[PDB]
A and B are shown apart, each in its own frame.
With several copies, the nearest count.
Chain A
Amino acid sequence: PKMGYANTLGQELYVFEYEKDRDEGIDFEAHSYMLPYCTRPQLLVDVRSDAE
């Protein structure tokens, strides 16, 4: 949600460079907006070693 990036294709990671005023140092920000999902969750089967 930074400007410039509205309604654009998402990326793996955003890194931004920001300078503190009065030469007080540097600020860093890293963003990521993601979600991994499976369209057929039934195919993910769990496995155990004990008995039911």
Chain B
Amino acid sequence: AYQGFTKLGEREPLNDIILWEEITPTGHSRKEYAPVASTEYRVGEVLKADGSKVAAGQEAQADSVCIVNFYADLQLSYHGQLKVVGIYRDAELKDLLKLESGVDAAAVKSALKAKGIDFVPTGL
């Protein structure tokens, strides 16, 4: 449509998944990842130890839940931080996870529970 319609875009998810975490003077249950080149991060995605998304099968070495919106094209993040931050130690988060196609949700949930993260059932 010449201009029948223009879609300006959509707003990225906000960092509201965190419900309870061990609040300490330093960063407890919060780890910094060096962003993987040409990789875009969002809130709720599950990360590996190296800093990449867990993929079908790779679901037992799940390491953290990303809580930032990183843009791979500008290499800065939502808040202008040049790092990727995710909750890895004991904490409580909503059930809003971005799992890459094929990922078993139960396996990553069990891995994060073993590492100390508990997921509160979230309504729709």
- Tally B residues with Cβ within 8 Å of A: 3
Q: How far is the CA of A20 from the CA of B23 in the complex (A)?
A: 9
Contacts of A22 in B (CB 8 A): 23
Q: How far is the CA of A29 from the CA of B23 in the complex (A)?
A: 13
- Count A-B contacts at CB 8 Å: 7
Contacts of A27 in B (CB 8 A): 20, 25
Within 8 A of B (CB), among A11-36: 20-22, 24, 27, 29
Q: How far is the CA of A21 from the CA of B20 in the complex (A)?
A: 11
Contacts of B25 in A (CB 8 A): 27, 29
Q: How far is the CB of A4 from chain B (nearest CB, A)?
A: 16
- B12-30: CB near A (< 8 Å → 1, else 0) gives 0000000010010100000
Q: How far is the CA of A21 from the CA of B25 in the complex (A)?
A: 11
Consensus secondary structure, chain A interface: mixed
Chain A interface bracket (under 10, 10 to 19, 20 to 34, 35 or more): under 10
Q: How far is the CA of A20 from the CA of B25 in the complex (A)?
A: 11
Contacts of A20 in B (CB 8 A): 23
Q: How far is the CA of A29 from the CA of B24 in the complex (A)?
A: 11
Contacts of A24 in B (CB 8 A): 23
Q: How far is the CB of B32 from chain A (nearest CB, A)?
A: 15
Chain B residues at the A interface, C-beta cutoff of 8 Å:
20, 23, 25
For this complex, 7 residue pairs linking A to B, each with C-beta atoms less than 8 Å apart, are A20-B23, A21-B23, A22-B23, A24-B23, A27-B20, A27-B25, A29-B25
Pairs A-B, 7 closest by C-beta atoms: A21-B23, A22-B23, A24-B23, A27-B25, A20-B23, A29-B25, A27-B20
